[model samples]
Structure formats: structure tokens, C-alpha cells
Target chain A: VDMRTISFDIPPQEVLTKDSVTISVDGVVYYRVQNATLAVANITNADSATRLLAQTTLRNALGTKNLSQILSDREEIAHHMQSTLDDATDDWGIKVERVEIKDVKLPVQ
Target chain B: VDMRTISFDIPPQEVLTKDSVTISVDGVVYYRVQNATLAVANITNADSATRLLAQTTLRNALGTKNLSQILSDREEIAHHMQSTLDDATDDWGIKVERVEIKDVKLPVQ
Candidate 1:
């Protein structure tokens, strides 16, 4: 009932996989502002910065994992990315709760 | 946000597929009580009845589809189940808004 966690969608991006297959991937991230003062003072725009950071982090993380792993191992990939994002945003006062890869679409041709 | 729709989780059930594999399936249903008069008068308990009906309906619907289809065709199955549940509950004044199959767990053999 009470709003605690904030969630945002990570728009689909064309990411070249480790195996060189170009795929479109999209997902979501759930986070909580653990410290409002740090969030406000340390970051210019917490929400926008967090979201854009997530986009690049997703691309950078998936860039190492291949197409098959992208298809078969979403949970592990998200977990690693969550840790990566959480560590990076610790100073921003944002606690990354969950990182989920919603969809991955590969080229048809 | 003002709440207009009520959602309930469909508890997992072991449903035997047409191809003879028993898999545990669970989902969620969102609906609104469109007519309170009919809802209160027609059904003994609208919420309980709808939830129970969804469980049975899910089993019945998935019983006809094979394992591969169950794994791959969740969207279509949910759509059909939503329609089926909506039609059956029209007399009880329930409007089924959405039906989503969350997970399909296969046996470890």
C-alpha cells in the first residue's frame, strides 16, 4: 500500500553480443533511495542518472555474455548486473533491489 | 493511485498435458466488480468463487495443450483463459481484465 520502492523500465537497446550477434534487449530495475540527502546532494538527477547508468550497464554486462547465455541464463546475468549497478550507485544513495531482463529479441535474418 | 481493479494469484496446480506430462502452472488474474448488485446477489462469494474458478479453468484450459505449447504459447493461452473466465463470470458481474501465466515448472527427471 505504501510506496517504498521505485521501478523504471530499461528501454530496448541494440547490443552486440560476445558471439557477435546483434540483439535487442530490455528490462526493468527496482531501487530505493536509502538516503534522500545523499541522493539529492551527491547526484544532479538521481532518477535520470540511475536509469541512463542502467542502460549502459546492461549493455556493458551483456556485451560479455554470448547469445546462448543471454537466452538461457537471464537470472545470473541480472544478478551480476545488479551487483555491478549497486556498487556503482552506493555513493548516489540508491540501493538496487532487483534487476530483471524482461526480453531479448535476436535478428531474424 | 486509486485502486479500481482487484488481482488475485492463481495457485499452482499440477495439470496433465495432452502429451501426458504433468507440469505445475501458476498465474495471476485481474478483474473488476462491474455490477455490485449482481455480484452480491448472484454469487455466494465473488472473490473466493472467482479465484477457485480460475484454478479449475486454468487446469482445464492447459490440459488440452501440449508441453511445448505450454512453454512457448503462454500469451495466447492466457488470452483464451481470460475470455473463458470473463464469459463464465458475466452472470456474476465480474469483468476479467487480464490473465497472465507467470511460471511453468517442469519436472526434474
Candidate 2:
């Protein structure tokens, strides 16, 4: 199973949570601001996994940001995201075998 | 800041270590064999990092074996490899940021 956690540290004053942001796995567009909270849609299977992996790869490879720097401050972001995914998938009998922060990309100015 | 560890469990009777195996990071050829022990060669810079990353991706995406299975059987492979690399790079002051066994491709039957 594929479990990924993406993190951002936009300063506490910036109001960054699941809401007021867009979250997509493998470019399928899972979250788009609902009631000021972010939501991730259900993923179906292996194909979905492949796609998500690709998006993550692209983001990490091309997005001009150093992940290590961001993570040095917002260490908890990974934990929170992993928890969100874990809770979401507990009922499906699909254990989250691994969780990784594959890469992070910062938005360009 | 890149650290990857690959593990294999060929059974205790099977004699699996740094020897008798070929190892590579980012596809630059790190190990061959010398007197039945596996060895990893030194890597230089970002280009080497990029190439190693690509090789890892290719191995994970295309290799035909289940990593979870191998890991289940040979649980310490990751740790051992990580330690080996750690010892090798300790003098350079490069911290092993993360360790992952991206993929495992079993030999074609």
C-alpha cells in the first residue's frame, strides 16, 4: 500500500490546514475547499497508486524547493497527514504498510 | 542528505550480505564483489544523486517482486545496509536523511 504525507509550514498566522488549500494525490484532485476544511477523495486501486506516485515524483523532481528545510520546522505536518490517511483507511481492511514524505514542492513566486 | 537502504532475506542458509551481490545508488554503480562481500562505491554530487534517484525509481516501478514480502522475511536488511552506508559516509559529514527500499525486482524466472 502507498501512504504519503506532504507538509507545509506557512507560519501559524497563515491559516493553513486542510481547508483554504487544494490537496491532490497523483493529480486526481481530491480536495477543493469545503466548509473551510480539506478533504481527500477515495482512491480505487493500483492504477490510482501509480498515478499518485507519478504526481509526487513530478512535484519533488521539478518543484524548486528544498524539502529538508521546510521539514526542519514543520515536523508535525507529516504526522498529521499520516493520521488523516490512516483514519480514513482503517475501515477498508487495507493496512497502511508504509508512510513517506516522498518530496515537497514550494509554490513559485 | 539522501540515504537509501535496500534489504534482502535469502534465508540464513542463503548467505546474503554485501558480498555476492551488486548494489547501486542512483545508478552509478556502487558495488560489485570482492572476496564474497558486497561493497558500495562513493558518490560525488547532485548529478550522482539525480541518477541514483532515477535508478531507484526504475527499480521500484519496474522490478517484479513484492518488497513487503522480502522485507517481512529479511527485516534487518534495511538496517544493515543503512549502517554500512552510514559507516562509509561518516567521515564526509553527510547525514543519512532517510532510508527507504524503494523497490525489489526478483530475477526473472
Candidate 3:
């Protein structure tokens, strides 16, 4: 069972949001395989799927919200990310347990 | 040629001078052999003779002087000692170039 966080880095994306403020986002994803047999049969590596999916979701979800909301609530943003991944991950026998936002490039200055 | 101070300690002598004080005299004897051949021929070891003779001379010289004289004029006293030892050491080719006096037992209350 993949019972550990799918810790990874997002590429240093030069993101200029529709609101015109630029920020780079990096984060970690915590996940687990609910059924090892199903996960192995379906994806070969559940953690890998979880990692790739999380990176995609982090950008997609955070891109919708402005920098203020992203900075103000990573825990909240992570919950949103968990929900976003739940439906897709469930089909692959992977439970999207938690999402954790880490360094934000907007704050570096 | 032996060219170093023959450092040594003298036992705490019980001085019974008019204004008497006991002191453990610690000192060193610096000398060199003028002729290593003569020093080797006349004495089994020049250093041995130097040590033996220095101890005797130190005692004899310091014994005659009171505590005040011994403390106040140690350099002068060492000069006097070297003079005394010069003739005696001449046969063995050991030159008593210098002597140094160190700590004494008279510092305590």
C-alpha cells in the first residue's frame, strides 16, 4: 500500500494569472492506495499516478484562485485539491488523502 | 658539546639564620662544553658532573646568604656561583656560562 505522501516539486512555472499577478507554486501530495491489487492492476505505480495527478491539480486549482486566497489558506486549498483528485484517484484505487502547499514564489521578494 | 640548562630541584633546606626562613630552591644550570674531548676524557659525562657540581655549589652559595640576600640578588648570586664553578669545571672543559633561579618556598603566609 502506498501509505506515504507523494512528495514532489512542480516545475518553476512563470505563471501570470488572469488577474495579472505572477507567482510560482510548488507543493507536496499525501496519498494512499485503498486497494493495492486494484491500484497495481490499474496504474502499475499508484504513487506515480498520485504525483502526476497532484501536480496537474495544483496548477489547475490554484490557477482559478488569486494569490491572496492561495497564500491565505493552503490548508483550505489542499482540501479543495483533495476533493478535486478524489473522483479520478478513487477509480485508480488511490485515495487522495491530503494535499500540502509549500513554497510560493510570490513571497520570495 | 653539551649546550643547555641542566634543570633540577634542591630539597627544602632548614635555614637557621639570624632572621631565618625555609625555602625549597628550584633552579637550572646552563652551560656548554668548551672541549668535548676534554669533557669526555676528564669526566665520565660532563652533564653528570655539571648536575652534581651545580647542586653542591647552589647549596653552598645559597646557604651562606640570608633569605633577603638570596631573593634580592639571585642573578648576582648566580654570577658568583658561575665564578666559583668556572675553575672547578675548567679541568672537565665544562664552561658554566649561566645559571637561573626559579620559585622558592618563602611565598606562603
Candidate of highest TM-score: 1
List, residue by residue over B27-63, the lDDT tens digit for candidate 2.
1123212211122234454323433443443343223
Error of 3 at A59 (Å): 0.5
lDDT sort, best first: 1, 3, 2
Candidate by candidate, in order, the iRMS in Å equals: 10.6, 14.0, 34.0
Q: Candidate 1, DockQ to 2 decimals?
A: 0.02
Candidate order, DockQ descending: 1, 2, 3
Stronger candidate by lDDT (1 vs 3): 1
TM-score, chain B, each candidate: 0.91, 0.34, 0.76
Task: Give the per-residue lDDT of model 3 (tens digit) for A1-109.
Answer: 6555445555545565445456666666667777768787763466667767777787777678765465556678778887998766876788777666655543211
Off by over 4 Å in 2: A1-109, B1-43, B46-71, B107-109
The lDDT for every candidate, in the order shown, is 0.80, 0.31, 0.65
Query: After superposition on all CA atoms, what RMSD does each candidate show versus the true structure?
Result: 11.5, 18.5, 29.0
State the displacement of the C-alpha of residue B34, model 3, in Å, after optimal TM-score superposition. Answer: 68
Give the Cα-based TM-score of candidate 2 against the true structure.
Answer: 0.22
Query: Per-residue lDDT tens digits of candidate 1, residues A36-75?
Result: 7778775366787789889999999889987656655778
